[PDB]
mmCIF file of all heavy atoms in Angstrom:
data_model
loop_
_atom_site.group_PDB
_atom_site.id
_atom_site.type_symbol
_atom_site.label_atom_id
_atom_site.label_comp_id
_atom_site.label_asym_id
_atom_site.label_seq_id
_atom_site.Cartn_x
_atom_site.Cartn_y
_atom_site.Cartn_z
ATOM 1 N N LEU D 38 -21.397 -10.464 -28.519
ATOM 2 C CA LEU D 38 -22.081 -9.392 -29.237
ATOM 3 C C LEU D 38 -23.163 -9.937 -30.161
ATOM 4 O O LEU D 38 -24.270 -9.385 -30.225
ATOM 5 C CB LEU D 38 -21.068 -8.565 -30.026
ATOM 6 C CG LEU D 38 -20.104 -7.721 -29.193
ATOM 7 C CD1 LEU D 38 -18.828 -7.465 -29.972
ATOM 8 C CD2 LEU D 38 -20.757 -6.413 -28.773
ATOM 9 N N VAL D 39 -22.868 -11.021 -30.884
ATOM 10 C CA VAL D 39 -23.855 -11.597 -31.791
ATOM 11 C C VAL D 39 -25.090 -12.034 -31.019
ATOM 12 O O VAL D 39 -26.224 -11.774 -31.435
ATOM 13 C CB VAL D 39 -23.241 -12.761 -32.591
ATOM 14 C CG1 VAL D 39 -24.327 -13.561 -33.287
ATOM 15 C CG2 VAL D 39 -22.249 -12.230 -33.607
ATOM 16 N N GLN D 42 -27.214 -9.125 -30.065
ATOM 17 C CA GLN D 42 -28.026 -8.531 -31.121
ATOM 18 C C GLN D 42 -29.191 -9.405 -31.570
ATOM 19 O O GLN D 42 -29.962 -8.976 -32.436
ATOM 20 C CB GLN D 42 -27.154 -8.189 -32.337
ATOM 21 C CG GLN D 42 -25.900 -7.405 -31.998
ATOM 22 C CD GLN D 42 -26.204 -6.034 -31.428
ATOM 23 O OE1 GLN D 42 -27.250 -5.449 -31.709
ATOM 24 N NE2 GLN D 42 -25.288 -5.516 -30.618
ATOM 25 N N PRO D 44 -32.737 -10.991 -30.831
ATOM 26 C CA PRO D 44 -33.845 -10.852 -29.881
ATOM 27 C C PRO D 44 -34.393 -12.200 -29.440
ATOM 28 O O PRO D 44 -34.248 -13.221 -30.117
ATOM 29 C CB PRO D 44 -34.889 -10.063 -30.676
ATOM 30 C CG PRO D 44 -34.616 -10.430 -32.095
ATOM 31 C CD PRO D 44 -33.124 -10.595 -32.196
ATOM 32 N N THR D 175 -16.556 -4.421 -23.651
ATOM 33 C CA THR D 175 -17.035 -4.569 -25.019
ATOM 34 C C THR D 175 -18.342 -3.820 -25.230
ATOM 35 O O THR D 175 -18.516 -3.139 -26.245
ATOM 36 C CB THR D 175 -17.208 -6.049 -25.355
ATOM 37 O OG1 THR D 175 -15.983 -6.746 -25.095
ATOM 38 C CG2 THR D 175 -17.577 -6.221 -26.816
ATOM 39 N N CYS D 178 -17.550 -0.003 -25.225
ATOM 40 C CA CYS D 178 -16.885 0.395 -26.461
ATOM 41 C C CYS D 178 -17.845 0.351 -27.641
ATOM 42 O O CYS D 178 -17.812 1.230 -28.510
ATOM 43 C CB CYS D 178 -15.675 -0.503 -26.718
ATOM 44 S SG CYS D 178 -14.362 -0.367 -25.483
ATOM 45 N N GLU D 179 -18.704 -0.670 -27.696
ATOM 46 C CA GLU D 179 -19.697 -0.747 -28.760
ATOM 47 C C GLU D 179 -20.658 0.429 -28.695
ATOM 48 O O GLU D 179 -21.014 1.002 -29.729
ATOM 49 C CB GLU D 179 -20.457 -2.072 -28.674
ATOM 50 C CG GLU D 179 -21.464 -2.290 -29.793
ATOM 51 C CD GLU D 179 -22.863 -1.841 -29.418
ATOM 52 O OE1 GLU D 179 -23.220 -1.938 -28.225
ATOM 53 O OE2 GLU D 179 -23.605 -1.393 -30.317
ATOM 54 N N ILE D 181 -20.029 3.441 -27.453
ATOM 55 C CA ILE D 181 -19.320 4.656 -27.861
ATOM 56 C C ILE D 181 -19.141 4.689 -29.376
ATOM 57 O O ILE D 181 -19.381 5.713 -30.028
ATOM 58 C CB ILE D 181 -17.971 4.766 -27.131
ATOM 59 C CG1 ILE D 181 -18.184 4.813 -25.617
ATOM 60 C CG2 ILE D 181 -17.214 5.998 -27.597
ATOM 61 C CD1 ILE D 181 -16.904 4.722 -24.817
ATOM 62 N N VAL D 182 -18.725 3.564 -29.963
ATOM 63 C CA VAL D 182 -18.491 3.523 -31.403
ATOM 64 C C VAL D 182 -19.802 3.682 -32.166
ATOM 65 O O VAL D 182 -19.836 4.297 -33.238
ATOM 66 C CB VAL D 182 -17.748 2.232 -31.787
ATOM 67 C CG1 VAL D 182 -17.641 2.103 -33.297
ATOM 68 C CG2 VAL D 182 -16.360 2.238 -31.173
ATOM 69 N N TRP D 183 -20.900 3.139 -31.634
ATOM 70 C CA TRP D 183 -22.197 3.344 -32.265
ATOM 71 C C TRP D 183 -22.595 4.814 -32.221
ATOM 72 O O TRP D 183 -22.983 5.393 -33.241
ATOM 73 C CB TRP D 183 -23.257 2.477 -31.585
ATOM 74 C CG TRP D 183 -24.589 2.526 -32.268
ATOM 75 C CD1 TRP D 183 -25.677 3.256 -31.890
ATOM 76 C CD2 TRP D 183 -24.973 1.819 -33.453
ATOM 77 N NE1 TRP D 183 -26.716 3.046 -32.764
ATOM 78 C CE2 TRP D 183 -26.308 2.168 -33.733
ATOM 79 C CE3 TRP D 183 -24.318 0.923 -34.303
ATOM 80 C CZ2 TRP D 183 -27.000 1.652 -34.827
ATOM 81 C CZ3 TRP D 183 -25.006 0.415 -35.389
ATOM 82 C CH2 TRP D 183 -26.332 0.781 -35.641
ATOM 83 N N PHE D 186 -20.499 6.563 -34.874
ATOM 84 C CA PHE D 186 -20.503 6.172 -36.279
ATOM 85 C C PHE D 186 -21.811 5.544 -36.751
ATOM 86 O O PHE D 186 -21.825 4.935 -37.828
ATOM 87 C CB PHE D 186 -19.359 5.188 -36.564
ATOM 88 C CG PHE D 186 -18.005 5.829 -36.649
ATOM 89 C CD1 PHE D 186 -17.089 5.682 -35.622
ATOM 90 C CD2 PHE D 186 -17.642 6.565 -37.764
ATOM 91 C CE1 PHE D 186 -15.840 6.266 -35.700
ATOM 92 C CE2 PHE D 186 -16.395 7.152 -37.849
ATOM 93 C CZ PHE D 186 -15.493 7.000 -36.815
ATOM 94 N N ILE D 246 -5.710 7.613 -18.990
ATOM 95 C CA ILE D 246 -4.507 6.895 -19.399
ATOM 96 C C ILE D 246 -3.277 7.504 -18.739
ATOM 97 O O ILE D 246 -2.392 6.787 -18.256
ATOM 98 C CB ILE D 246 -4.383 6.889 -20.934
ATOM 99 C CG1 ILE D 246 -5.387 5.913 -21.547
ATOM 100 C CG2 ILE D 246 -2.968 6.539 -21.361
ATOM 101 C CD1 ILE D 246 -5.702 6.207 -22.995
ATOM 102 N N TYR D 247 -3.204 8.836 -18.706
ATOM 103 C CA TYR D 247 -2.060 9.499 -18.088
ATOM 104 C C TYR D 247 -1.979 9.184 -16.598
ATOM 105 O O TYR D 247 -0.916 8.814 -16.089
ATOM 106 C CB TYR D 247 -2.143 11.007 -18.314
ATOM 107 C CG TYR D 247 -0.975 11.767 -17.733
ATOM 108 C CD1 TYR D 247 0.326 11.466 -18.108
ATOM 109 C CD2 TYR D 247 -1.171 12.782 -16.807
ATOM 110 C CE1 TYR D 247 1.399 12.154 -17.582
ATOM 111 C CE2 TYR D 247 -0.103 13.478 -16.273
ATOM 112 C CZ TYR D 247 1.180 13.158 -16.666
ATOM 113 O OH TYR D 247 2.251 13.845 -16.141
ATOM 114 N N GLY D 250 -0.878 5.522 -15.489
ATOM 115 C CA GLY D 250 0.533 5.193 -15.514
ATOM 116 C C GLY D 250 1.317 5.676 -14.316
ATOM 117 O O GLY D 250 2.496 5.336 -14.187
ATOM 118 N N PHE D 251 0.692 6.466 -13.446
ATOM 119 C CA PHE D 251 1.346 6.901 -12.219
ATOM 120 C C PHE D 251 1.652 5.698 -11.339
ATOM 121 O O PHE D 251 0.810 4.816 -11.149
ATOM 122 C CB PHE D 251 0.456 7.886 -11.457
ATOM 123 C CG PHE D 251 0.492 9.291 -11.991
ATOM 124 C CD1 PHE D 251 0.415 9.542 -13.350
ATOM 125 C CD2 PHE D 251 0.587 10.367 -11.123
ATOM 126 C CE1 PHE D 251 0.442 10.835 -13.833
ATOM 127 C CE2 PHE D 251 0.615 11.662 -11.600
ATOM 128 C CZ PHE D 251 0.541 11.896 -12.957
ATOM 129 N N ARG D 252 2.866 5.663 -10.795
ATOM 130 C CA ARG D 252 3.262 4.556 -9.938
ATOM 131 C C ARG D 252 4.417 4.995 -9.050
ATOM 132 O O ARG D 252 5.293 5.747 -9.486
ATOM 133 C CB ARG D 252 3.663 3.325 -10.763
ATOM 134 C CG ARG D 252 4.856 3.545 -11.678
ATOM 135 C CD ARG D 252 4.742 2.723 -12.951
ATOM 136 N NE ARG D 252 5.846 2.988 -13.866
ATOM 137 C CZ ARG D 252 5.932 4.052 -14.652
ATOM 138 N NH1 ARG D 252 4.986 4.978 -14.666
ATOM 139 N NH2 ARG D 252 6.991 4.191 -15.443
ATOM 140 N N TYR D 253 4.397 4.535 -7.803
ATOM 141 C CA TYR D 253 5.518 4.710 -6.888
ATOM 142 C C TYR D 253 6.369 3.448 -6.960
ATOM 143 O O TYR D 253 5.941 2.377 -6.518
ATOM 144 C CB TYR D 253 5.023 4.974 -5.468
ATOM 145 C CG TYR D 253 6.074 5.530 -4.529
ATOM 146 C CD1 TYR D 253 5.984 6.831 -4.052
ATOM 147 C CD2 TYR D 253 7.151 4.755 -4.117
ATOM 148 C CE1 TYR D 253 6.937 7.344 -3.193
ATOM 149 C CE2 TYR D 253 8.110 5.261 -3.261
ATOM 150 C CZ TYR D 253 7.997 6.556 -2.802
ATOM 151 O OH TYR D 253 8.949 7.064 -1.948
ATOM 152 N N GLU D 254 7.570 3.572 -7.516
ATOM 153 C CA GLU D 254 8.443 2.425 -7.737
ATOM 154 C C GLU D 254 9.323 2.229 -6.508
ATOM 155 O O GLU D 254 10.216 3.040 -6.238
ATOM 156 C CB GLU D 254 9.283 2.626 -8.995
ATOM 157 C CG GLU D 254 8.558 2.271 -10.283
ATOM 158 C CD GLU D 254 9.306 2.728 -11.519
ATOM 159 O OE1 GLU D 254 10.063 3.717 -11.427
ATOM 160 O OE2 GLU D 254 9.138 2.096 -12.584
ATOM 161 N N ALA D 401 -1.780 6.225 -1.235
ATOM 162 C CA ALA D 401 -1.903 5.947 -2.662
ATOM 163 C C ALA D 401 -3.302 5.458 -3.007
ATOM 164 O O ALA D 401 -3.899 5.915 -3.986
ATOM 165 C CB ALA D 401 -0.855 4.922 -3.092
ATOM 166 N N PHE D 404 -5.912 8.420 -2.549
ATOM 167 C CA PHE D 404 -5.834 9.414 -3.611
ATOM 168 C C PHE D 404 -6.193 8.823 -4.966
ATOM 169 O O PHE D 404 -6.719 9.539 -5.820
ATOM 170 C CB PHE D 404 -4.448 10.051 -3.661
ATOM 171 C CG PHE D 404 -4.433 11.392 -4.334
ATOM 172 C CD1 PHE D 404 -5.192 12.437 -3.833
ATOM 173 C CD2 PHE D 404 -3.675 11.608 -5.472
ATOM 174 C CE1 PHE D 404 -5.188 13.673 -4.447
ATOM 175 C CE2 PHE D 404 -3.669 12.844 -6.091
ATOM 176 C CZ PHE D 404 -4.426 13.877 -5.578
ATOM 177 N N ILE D 435 -9.168 -2.058 -20.449
ATOM 178 C CA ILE D 435 -8.193 -2.120 -21.535
ATOM 179 C C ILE D 435 -6.777 -2.001 -20.987
ATOM 180 O O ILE D 435 -5.850 -2.657 -21.476
ATOM 181 C CB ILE D 435 -8.483 -1.040 -22.593
ATOM 182 C CG1 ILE D 435 -9.888 -1.211 -23.156
ATOM 183 C CG2 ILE D 435 -7.487 -1.140 -23.725
ATOM 184 C CD1 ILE D 435 -10.319 -0.093 -24.075
ATOM 185 N N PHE D 439 -3.674 -4.552 -21.328
ATOM 186 C CA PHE D 439 -2.335 -4.113 -21.712
ATOM 187 C C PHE D 439 -1.296 -4.554 -20.685
ATOM 188 O O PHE D 439 -0.163 -4.900 -21.041
ATOM 189 C CB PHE D 439 -2.320 -2.594 -21.887
ATOM 190 C CG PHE D 439 -0.943 -2.000 -21.968
ATOM 191 C CD1 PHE D 439 -0.160 -2.186 -23.094
ATOM 192 C CD2 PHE D 439 -0.437 -1.243 -20.924
ATOM 193 C CE1 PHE D 439 1.103 -1.635 -23.176
ATOM 194 C CE2 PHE D 439 0.826 -0.691 -20.999
ATOM 195 C CZ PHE D 439 1.597 -0.887 -22.127
ATOM 196 N N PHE M 9 -4.015 14.485 5.065
ATOM 197 C CA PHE M 9 -4.259 13.672 3.878
ATOM 198 C C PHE M 9 -3.852 14.410 2.610
ATOM 199 O O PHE M 9 -3.250 13.821 1.705
ATOM 200 C CB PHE M 9 -5.732 13.266 3.813
ATOM 201 C CG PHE M 9 -6.159 12.744 2.470
ATOM 202 C CD1 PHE M 9 -5.578 11.606 1.934
ATOM 203 C CD2 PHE M 9 -7.141 13.396 1.742
ATOM 204 C CE1 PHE M 9 -5.972 11.126 0.699
ATOM 205 C CE2 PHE M 9 -7.537 12.921 0.506
ATOM 206 C CZ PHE M 9 -6.952 11.786 -0.016
ATOM 207 N N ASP M 12 -0.033 14.491 2.391
ATOM 208 C CA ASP M 12 0.467 13.168 2.032
ATOM 209 C C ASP M 12 0.227 12.869 0.558
ATOM 210 O O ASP M 12 1.094 12.302 -0.116
ATOM 211 C CB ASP M 12 -0.186 12.101 2.911
ATOM 212 C CG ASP M 12 0.192 12.240 4.372
ATOM 213 O OD1 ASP M 12 1.132 13.004 4.674
ATOM 214 O OD2 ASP M 12 -0.452 11.584 5.218
ATOM 215 N N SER M 13 -0.946 13.245 0.039
ATOM 216 C CA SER M 13 -1.234 13.028 -1.375
ATOM 217 C C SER M 13 -0.303 13.845 -2.265
ATOM 218 O O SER M 13 0.165 13.356 -3.302
ATOM 219 C CB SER M 13 -2.693 13.373 -1.668
ATOM 220 O OG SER M 13 -3.568 12.614 -0.854
ATOM 221 N N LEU M 16 3.038 12.181 -2.246
ATOM 222 C CA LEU M 16 2.983 10.965 -3.051
ATOM 223 C C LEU M 16 3.077 11.283 -4.537
ATOM 224 O O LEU M 16 3.922 10.727 -5.249
ATOM 225 C CB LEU M 16 1.695 10.202 -2.751
ATOM 226 C CG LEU M 16 1.370 9.071 -3.727
ATOM 227 C CD1 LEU M 16 2.133 7.802 -3.370
ATOM 228 C CD2 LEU M 16 -0.125 8.823 -3.776
ATOM 229 N N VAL M 17 2.191 12.137 -5.032
ATOM 230 C CA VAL M 17 2.171 12.404 -6.465
ATOM 231 C C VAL M 17 3.488 12.989 -6.929
ATOM 232 O O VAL M 17 3.896 12.772 -8.065
ATOM 233 C CB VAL M 17 1.017 13.339 -6.856
ATOM 234 C CG1 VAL M 17 -0.315 12.682 -6.540
ATOM 235 C CG2 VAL M 17 1.144 14.672 -6.139
ATOM 236 N N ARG M 19 6.426 12.252 -5.535
ATOM 237 C CA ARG M 19 7.389 11.170 -5.489
ATOM 238 C C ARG M 19 7.088 10.091 -6.508
ATOM 239 O O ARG M 19 7.877 9.168 -6.687
ATOM 240 C CB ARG M 19 7.414 10.549 -4.096
ATOM 241 C CG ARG M 19 7.941 11.474 -3.019
ATOM 242 C CD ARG M 19 9.436 11.695 -3.185
ATOM 243 N NE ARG M 19 10.134 10.434 -3.394
ATOM 244 C CZ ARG M 19 10.572 9.658 -2.408
ATOM 245 N NH1 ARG M 19 10.357 9.999 -1.145
ATOM 246 N NH2 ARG M 19 11.203 8.525 -2.685
ATOM 247 N N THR M 21 6.344 8.162 -10.174
ATOM 248 C CA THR M 21 7.004 8.112 -11.477
ATOM 249 C C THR M 21 5.970 8.472 -12.535
ATOM 250 O O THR M 21 5.225 7.624 -13.025
ATOM 251 C CB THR M 21 7.611 6.737 -11.726
ATOM 252 O OG1 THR M 21 8.557 6.436 -10.692
ATOM 253 C CG2 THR M 21 8.319 6.702 -13.073
ATOM 254 N N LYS M 22 5.919 9.755 -12.882
ATOM 255 C CA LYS M 22 4.969 10.213 -13.883
ATOM 256 C C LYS M 22 5.350 9.666 -15.257
ATOM 257 O O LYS M 22 6.535 9.632 -15.605
ATOM 258 C CB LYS M 22 4.925 11.740 -13.923
ATOM 259 C CG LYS M 22 4.004 12.370 -12.889
ATOM 260 C CD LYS M 22 4.653 12.426 -11.517
ATOM 261 C CE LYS M 22 5.765 13.460 -11.477
ATOM 262 N NZ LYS M 22 6.357 13.587 -10.118
ATOM 263 N N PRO M 23 4.378 9.220 -16.050
ATOM 264 C CA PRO M 23 4.696 8.708 -17.388
ATOM 265 C C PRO M 23 5.289 9.793 -18.273
ATOM 266 O O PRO M 23 4.898 10.959 -18.208
ATOM 267 C CB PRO M 23 3.339 8.229 -17.918
ATOM 268 C CG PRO M 23 2.488 8.053 -16.700
ATOM 269 C CD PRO M 23 2.943 9.111 -15.747
ATOM 270 N N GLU M 27 6.297 6.435 -22.945
ATOM 271 C CA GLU M 27 5.380 5.483 -22.330
ATOM 272 C C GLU M 27 3.922 5.863 -22.555
ATOM 273 O O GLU M 27 3.078 4.983 -22.770
ATOM 274 C CB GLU M 27 5.660 5.374 -20.828
ATOM 275 C CG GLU M 27 4.869 4.285 -20.125
ATOM 276 C CD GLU M 27 5.242 4.148 -18.662
ATOM 277 O OE1 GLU M 27 6.099 4.926 -18.190
ATOM 278 O OE2 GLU M 27 4.679 3.264 -17.983
ATOM 279 N N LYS M 30 2.801 4.784 -26.021
ATOM 280 C CA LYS M 30 2.598 3.340 -26.111
ATOM 281 C C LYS M 30 1.297 2.923 -25.435
ATOM 282 O O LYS M 30 0.519 2.135 -25.990
ATOM 283 C CB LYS M 30 3.787 2.606 -25.492
ATOM 284 C CG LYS M 30 3.534 1.131 -25.220
ATOM 285 C CD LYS M 30 4.784 0.438 -24.700
ATOM 286 C CE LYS M 30 5.387 1.190 -23.525
ATOM 287 N NZ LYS M 30 4.450 1.263 -22.371
ATOM 288 N N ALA M 34 -1.996 1.327 -27.285
ATOM 289 C CA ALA M 34 -2.574 0.041 -26.902
ATOM 290 C C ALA M 34 -4.045 0.182 -26.530
ATOM 291 O O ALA M 34 -4.880 -0.643 -26.930
ATOM 292 C CB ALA M 34 -1.782 -0.565 -25.744
ATOM 293 N N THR M 35 -4.384 1.224 -25.767
ATOM 294 C CA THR M 35 -5.778 1.445 -25.396
ATOM 295 C C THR M 35 -6.633 1.745 -26.619
ATOM 296 O O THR M 35 -7.768 1.264 -26.721
ATOM 297 C CB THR M 35 -5.884 2.581 -24.382
ATOM 298 O OG1 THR M 35 -5.209 3.737 -24.890
ATOM 299 C CG2 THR M 35 -5.263 2.171 -23.054
ATOM 300 N N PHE M 39 -9.790 -0.540 -27.726
ATOM 301 C CA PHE M 39 -11.083 0.109 -27.893
ATOM 302 C C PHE M 39 -11.590 -0.046 -29.317
ATOM 303 O O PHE M 39 -12.766 -0.354 -29.532
ATOM 304 C CB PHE M 39 -10.972 1.587 -27.516
ATOM 305 C CG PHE M 39 -12.187 2.401 -27.864
ATOM 306 C CD1 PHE M 39 -13.247 2.499 -26.981
ATOM 307 C CD2 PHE M 39 -12.260 3.086 -29.067
ATOM 308 C CE1 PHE M 39 -14.363 3.249 -27.296
ATOM 309 C CE2 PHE M 39 -13.373 3.836 -29.387
ATOM 310 C CZ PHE M 39 -14.425 3.918 -28.500
ATOM 311 N N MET M 42 -12.783 -3.866 -29.876
ATOM 312 C CA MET M 42 -14.077 -4.221 -29.294
ATOM 313 C C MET M 42 -15.209 -3.386 -29.884
ATOM 314 O O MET M 42 -16.240 -3.928 -30.310
ATOM 315 C CB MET M 42 -14.039 -4.086 -27.772
ATOM 316 C CG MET M 42 -12.781 -4.628 -27.128
ATOM 317 S SD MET M 42 -12.965 -4.795 -25.345
ATOM 318 C CE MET M 42 -12.044 -3.374 -24.784
ATOM 319 N N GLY M 43 -15.036 -2.063 -29.927
ATOM 320 C CA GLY M 43 -16.109 -1.199 -30.383
ATOM 321 C C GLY M 43 -16.478 -1.419 -31.835
ATOM 322 O O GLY M 43 -17.658 -1.449 -32.182
ATOM 323 N N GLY M 46 -18.264 -4.770 -32.307
ATOM 324 C CA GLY M 46 -19.658 -4.600 -31.924
ATOM 325 C C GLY M 46 -20.450 -3.793 -32.936
ATOM 326 O O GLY M 46 -21.602 -4.116 -33.238
ATOM 327 N N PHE M 47 -19.841 -2.736 -33.474
ATOM 328 C CA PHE M 47 -20.503 -1.885 -34.456
ATOM 329 C C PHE M 47 -20.838 -2.665 -35.722
ATOM 330 O O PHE M 47 -21.954 -2.574 -36.247
ATOM 331 C CB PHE M 47 -19.598 -0.688 -34.760
ATOM 332 C CG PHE M 47 -20.099 0.209 -35.853
ATOM 333 C CD1 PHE M 47 -21.263 0.939 -35.691
ATOM 334 C CD2 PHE M 47 -19.383 0.349 -37.029
ATOM 335 C CE1 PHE M 47 -21.715 1.775 -36.693
ATOM 336 C CE2 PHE M 47 -19.829 1.184 -38.032
ATOM 337 C CZ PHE M 47 -20.998 1.898 -37.865
ATOM 338 N N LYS M 50 -23.620 -5.221 -35.005
ATOM 339 C CA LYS M 50 -24.913 -4.544 -34.990
ATOM 340 C C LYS M 50 -25.375 -4.201 -36.402
ATOM 341 O O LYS M 50 -26.552 -4.379 -36.740
ATOM 342 C CB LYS M 50 -24.831 -3.285 -34.129
ATOM 343 C CG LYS M 50 -26.176 -2.693 -33.755
ATOM 344 C CD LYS M 50 -26.061 -1.805 -32.527
ATOM 345 C CE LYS M 50 -27.427 -1.357 -32.037
ATOM 346 N NZ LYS M 50 -27.337 -0.624 -30.745
ATOM 347 N N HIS M 53 -26.583 -7.382 -38.031
ATOM 348 C CA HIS M 53 -27.771 -7.978 -37.436
ATOM 349 C C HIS M 53 -29.005 -7.088 -37.487
ATOM 350 O O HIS M 53 -30.099 -7.573 -37.183
ATOM 351 C CB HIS M 53 -27.489 -8.364 -35.980
ATOM 352 C CG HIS M 53 -26.731 -9.646 -35.835
ATOM 353 N ND1 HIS M 53 -27.355 -10.865 -35.676
ATOM 354 C CD2 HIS M 53 -25.401 -9.900 -35.831
ATOM 355 C CE1 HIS M 53 -26.441 -11.814 -35.576
ATOM 356 N NE2 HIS M 53 -25.248 -11.255 -35.667
ATOM 357 N N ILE M 54 -28.874 -5.815 -37.849
ATOM 358 C CA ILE M 54 -30.070 -4.987 -38.016
ATOM 359 C C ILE M 54 -30.939 -5.545 -39.145
ATOM 360 O O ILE M 54 -32.122 -5.833 -38.904
ATOM 361 C CB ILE M 54 -29.715 -3.507 -38.246
ATOM 362 C CG1 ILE M 54 -29.270 -2.853 -36.936
ATOM 363 C CG2 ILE M 54 -30.897 -2.757 -38.841
ATOM 364 C CD1 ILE M 54 -28.776 -1.435 -37.102
ATOM 365 N N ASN M 57 -32.370 -8.894 -38.048
ATOM 366 C CA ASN M 57 -33.484 -8.737 -37.120
ATOM 367 C C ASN M 57 -34.746 -8.284 -37.843
ATOM 368 O O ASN M 57 -35.852 -8.716 -37.501
ATOM 369 C CB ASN M 57 -33.115 -7.752 -36.012
ATOM 370 C CG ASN M 57 -32.128 -8.335 -35.019
ATOM 371 O OD1 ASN M 57 -31.730 -9.495 -35.130
ATOM 372 N ND2 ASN M 57 -31.726 -7.531 -34.042
#
Side-chain angles (χ1 to χ4, degrees):
Chain D
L38 291 155
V39 167
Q42 310 296 333
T175 306
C178 296
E179 183 266 328
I181 300 172
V182 173
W183 186 259
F186 284 106
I246 286 158
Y247 181 57
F251 280 45
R252 62 213 177 282
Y253 196 112
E254 278 169 333
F404 202 60
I435 302 173
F439 167 72
Chain M
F9 165 61
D12 295 348
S13 303
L16 168 82
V17 297
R19 294 290 313 273
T21 301
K22 276 80 71 177
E27 187 176 2
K30 166 176 51 62
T35 53
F39 171 87
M42 317 194 257
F47 175 66
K50 195 159 188 173
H53 281 267
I54 285 174
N57 287 358

